[PDB]
Ligand binder design. Structure first.
Ligand SMILES: [Mg+2]
Ligand SMILES: [Mg+2]
Lengths: 354, 95, 19, 49, 43, 143, 80, 74, 53
RNA sequence: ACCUCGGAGCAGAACCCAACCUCCGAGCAGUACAUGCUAAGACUUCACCAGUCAAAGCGAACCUCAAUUGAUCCA
């Protein structure tokens, strides 16, 4: 029996009567390019994508954030052409390019990159680690405003904080310095949250470093509702990603639901839901910045368990499921002598009635 | 197989299966796989290890030789320096 | 499978030169 | 079993225990013509002794 | 006495392995060099 | 009896990256006959076109992790040409910074025989190794 | 309790503390467990044997770990 | 058939699962290794705009690798 | 009578041995092999023949 | 004339299927010497004998071909 094809089968638009005049696959690289763009395209038949590909809804994610400024593409393109034409006109780049001795300042490229198109890439990184799906249950934004944070270790050196960095708790035991490039008249807000830090329930976040009503870049007079307490990544719990996020407070708002006393290290008070928190307080403002890092267990984590948090430290551990074995059969055949050892519980011997 | 002898009228076990097999008290019988001492040069490593490993027996051929043997060979034996002590008994067997 | 609409999707000899 | 048999009182701990006192107590059978030259102690029972 | 004389015999030959091993690779290289010398005449 | 002392038996972490960082996640084995080896968690792909050069780290599911591009204005303002060996070593050096920024310490990159023999890719391979990224993973853990 | 044990000398005591930070309790007691065998005597046997092996060595994946520590160290070139 | 999604291959071209779960069959594109000359030169003879497919078995991992469990509250 | 099967012996005196095929015309061979006792690659020399094939 | 083994049609599409039915072949060869040791889980020439695939671990590097062959005792 045969059935017609539901959709248009491949290699159908082509014609077989004309075969020699057609242009051939010159190289392996041309084939895989055709194969790859074919793969990203959809197909009606059952494929690898519809089994192990996240099940994103067809509707685009909602993001009422800061739109881009209206840059004049005409003048912007002309200024770009002014830069490359004088670059090619220079004399020293010819030798340096063809002798392979040139380089580039990394931090300078980083500085101009994060101002030009960084927030789109940081948005891409955010959804990869799962910041948006865990925070807003899918809704996204674009952190247009840059954001730099550092942990002052001693006085000479410091640990930076950017998207996807590891941070030690010993260096994160104090408060960090923050800069977010705003002089801009109105207020701002900042908060530090841990997504997977909670242990009693999923989709619950803690809060370690909250500041509100910060006029301008200066951070000192910004009042704190939730005072500082470092995180506590337990041994064996794995890795916990700590998230910076920042909003554009257009006008001052009170904090009654959110107001907390002197720190007192009560996780029942520290825990809440960012989803409902955004729906109540943040209807006047919108996201402006974002960053995050990762933390792990260390000696200072053990210190705060016994001394600061006033509780016993937990000790988790990853346990795999047991190795599967089939149902026993009292007369095996063509199996090694250790068929019994695969099912015996006690490795030691024992004698029943003697 | 020689159900009643002539001098005493009792079953008689042939020493063939004694040299070939071994009993565990649960009723199981094991054996060394054949061809494990011939033409090892041509065999792949996966084959010769499969031959070196022991193998149990089906219930039928186990039942067949069980009819042959006598009750003396079926008793419980507590040997010393015997690795088969862990296996004479059975554990966690349902149906 | 033959009865299914996906039949003839993997065949490739009808493109290349026959010899 | 040794803890069990003394609790039953068939073999007295006041006197020295022996294979004779054991087999007189019928603690375990023995078949010397079946080539068993005695009896071993077994670690199973370390508790409650 | 049986395990001692064989173990020290193994230890004796053990110390001799790196010298003969270095000679072993040189044999294959001398056969490699001799291969190029002969097949050039075959060509 | 303390609220802070209250702890559940099981701890549920909703981070898929937690397992691979612990070397516990499963890497897709198979495709031995097919060229791109699925035995990875983070793969890089180079696209050396006749106009620009691209490099992007991607996850096993085909999702992009981080990208570096010669089309980006921030990178090309300081190059003479968008495809020279200088571009391949420079894009490799800046990608090493990005991988180290995004916590990507290990990753996979399978070049073809001609791609590996190319001096540009060799200097590209030398770039992130100096930056502090190695093109190898540890073997999986399980028993 | 570790620090109270007079039968252990001073340099051995803190050596066990810093090298076995995982097992110490909040109250300061070192906790140790073993469940390999069904016999509590044999369980107590290898328990003190591990303790004996610990004090002896005190009196005397990591490849991946040091890589990231080197990666973290070459990332933090930053002055105030 | 051809492997995929935790399905190894033996020397006798037999497919075998590596993870515990459900089996699935699909059809995807086939790109050989450069060493497979008969398959590499084949795709070069093909014309651009046309692509060949092949069957692929795929095992769906049912259960996760494991679970984080409390060991001691000290 | 093209090939010939030959055994080799451990020069360390351990007694580990195996077999491999050899051409009837080719000269004596000396190759490395992983001895399970010595537990590293060590040179074995083949001594005599066993059977033709 | 044949007696064993492998491939194709009969047997078109999961498996199997005979005829003194129609054809082509095999009783080797080549390259390494980790062609090392162990181990989860399964198939199996319709029984058994056999024949097969192999995760992972120790220890290391950084097999192709299709049949390509033979049990027990004994030496
Ligand atoms: Mg069968
Ligand atoms: Mg393996």
């Amino acid at each position: 029996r045969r059935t017609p094809p539901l959709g248009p089968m491949p290699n159908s638009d082509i014609d077989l009567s004309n075969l020699e005049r057609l242009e051939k696959y010159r190289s392996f690289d041309r084939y895989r390019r055709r194969a790859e763009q074919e793969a990203q395209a959809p197909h009606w038949w059952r494929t690898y994508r519809e089994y192990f590909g996240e099940k994103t809804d067809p509707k685009e994610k909602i993001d009422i954030g800061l739109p881009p400024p209206k840059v004049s593409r005409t003048q912007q393109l002309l200024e770009r052409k002014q830069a490359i034409q004088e670059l090619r006109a220079n004399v020293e780049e010819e030798r340096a390019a063809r002798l392979r001795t040139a380089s580039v300042p990394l931090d300078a490229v980083r500085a101009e990159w994060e101002r030009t198109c960084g927030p789109y890439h940081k948005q891409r990184l955010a959804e990869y680690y799962g910041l948006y799906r865990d925070l807003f249950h899918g809704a996204t934004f674009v952190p247009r405003v840059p954001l730099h944070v550092a942990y002052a270790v001693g006085e000479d050196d410091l640990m930076p904080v950017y998207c996807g960095n590891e941070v030690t708790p010993t260096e994160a035991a104090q408060a960090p310095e923050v800069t977010y490039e705003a002089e801009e008249g109105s207020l701002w807000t900042l908060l530090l949250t841990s997504l997977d830090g909670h242990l009693l329930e999923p989709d619950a976040e803690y809060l370690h470093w909250l500041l509100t009503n910060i006029p301008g870049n200066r951070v000192a007079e910004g009042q704190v509702t939730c005072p500082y307490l470092p995180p506590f990544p337990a041994r064996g719990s794995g890795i916990h990603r700590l998230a910076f996020l920042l909003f554009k407070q257009d006008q001052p708002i009170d904090f009654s639901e959110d107001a907390r006393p002197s720190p007192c290290y009560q996780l029942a008070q520290r825990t809440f839901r960012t989803f409902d928190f955004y729906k109540k307080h943040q209807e006047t403002m919108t996201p402006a910045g974002l960053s995050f890092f990762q933390c792990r267990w260390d000696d200072s984590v053990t210190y705060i368990f016994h001394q600061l948090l006033d509780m016993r430290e937990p000790v988790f551990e990853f346990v795999r499921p047991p190795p599967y074995h089939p149902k026993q059969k009292r007369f095996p055949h063509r199996q090694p002598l250790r068929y019994l050892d695969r099912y015996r519980d006690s490795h030691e011997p024992t004698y029943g009635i003697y | 197989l020689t159900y009643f002898s002539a001098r005493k009228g009792k079953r008689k076990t042939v020493k063939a299966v004694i040299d070939r097999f071994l009993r565990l008290h649960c009723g199981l019988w094991v054996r060394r796989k054949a061809g494990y001492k011939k033409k090892l040069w041509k065999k792949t490593p996966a084959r010769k290890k499969r031959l070196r490993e022991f193998v149990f027996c089906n219930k039928t051929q186990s039942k067949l030789l069980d009819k042959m043997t006598t009750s003396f060979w079926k008793r419980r034996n507590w040997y010393v320096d015997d690795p088969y002590q862990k296996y004479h008994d059975r554990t966690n067997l349902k149906v | 499978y033959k009865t299914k609409p996906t039949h003839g999707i993997g065949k490739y000899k009808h493109l290349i030169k026959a010899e | 079993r040794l803890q069990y048999l003394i609790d039953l009182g068939r073999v007295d701990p006041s006197q020295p225990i022996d294979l004779t006192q054991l087999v007189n107590g019928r603690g375990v059978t023995i078949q010397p013509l079946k080539r068993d030259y005695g009896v071993q102690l077994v670690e199973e029972g370390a508790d409650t002794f | 006495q049986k395990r001692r004389e064989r173990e020290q015999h193994i230890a004796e030959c053990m110390a001799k392995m790196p010298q003969m091993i270095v000679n072993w690779q040189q044999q294959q290289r001398e056969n490699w060099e001799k291969a190029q010398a002969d097949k050039e005449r075959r060509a | 009896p303390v609220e802070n002392e209250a702890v559940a038996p099981e701890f549920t972490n909703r981070n898929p990256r937690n397992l691979e960082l612990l070397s516990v996640a499963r890497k897709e084995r198979g495709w031995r006959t097919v060229f791109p080896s699925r035995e990875f968690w983070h793969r890089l792909r180079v696209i050396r076109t006749q106009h620009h050069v691209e490099a992007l780290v991607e996850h096993q599911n085909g999702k992009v992790v981080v990208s570096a591009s010669t089309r980006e204005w921030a990178i090309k303002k300081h190059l003479y040409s968008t495809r020279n060996v200088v571009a391949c070593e420079s894009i490799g050096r800046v990608l090493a910074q990005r991988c180290l920024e995004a916590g990507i310490n290990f990753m996979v990159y399978q070049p073809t025989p001609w791609e590996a023999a190319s001096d540009s890719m060799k200097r590209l391979q030398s770039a992130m190794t100096e930056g502090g990224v190695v093109l190898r993973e540890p073997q999986r853990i399980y028993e | 309790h570790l620090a109270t044990a007079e039968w252990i000398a001073e340099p051995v005591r803190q050596k066990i503390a810093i090298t076995h930070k995982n097992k110490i309790n909040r109250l300061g007691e070192l906790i140790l467990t073993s469940e390999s065998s069904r016999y509590q005597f044999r369980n107590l046997a290898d328990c003190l044997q591990k303790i004996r092996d610990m004090i002896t060595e005190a009196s005397q994946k990591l490849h991946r770990i040091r890589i990231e520590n080197m990666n973290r160290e070459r990332l933090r070139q930053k002055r105030i | 058939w051809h492997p995929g999604a935790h399905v190894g291959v033996g020397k006798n071209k037999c497919l075998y699962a590596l993870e515990e779960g459900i089996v699935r069959y699909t059809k995807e594109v086939y790109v050989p290794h450069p060493r497979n000359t008969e398959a590499v030169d084949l795709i070069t003879r093909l014309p651009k705009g046309a692509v060949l497919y092949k069957t692929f078995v795929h095992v769906v991992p049912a259960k996760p690798e494991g679970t984080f469990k409390l060991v001691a509250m000290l | 009578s093209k090939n010939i099967l030959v055994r080799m012996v451990s020069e360390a005196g351990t007694g580990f041995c195996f077999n491999t095929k050899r051409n009837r015309l080719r000269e004596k061979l000396t190759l490395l092999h992983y001895d399970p006792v010595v537990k590293q690659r060590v040179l074995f020399v083949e001594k005599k023949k066993i059977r033709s094939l």
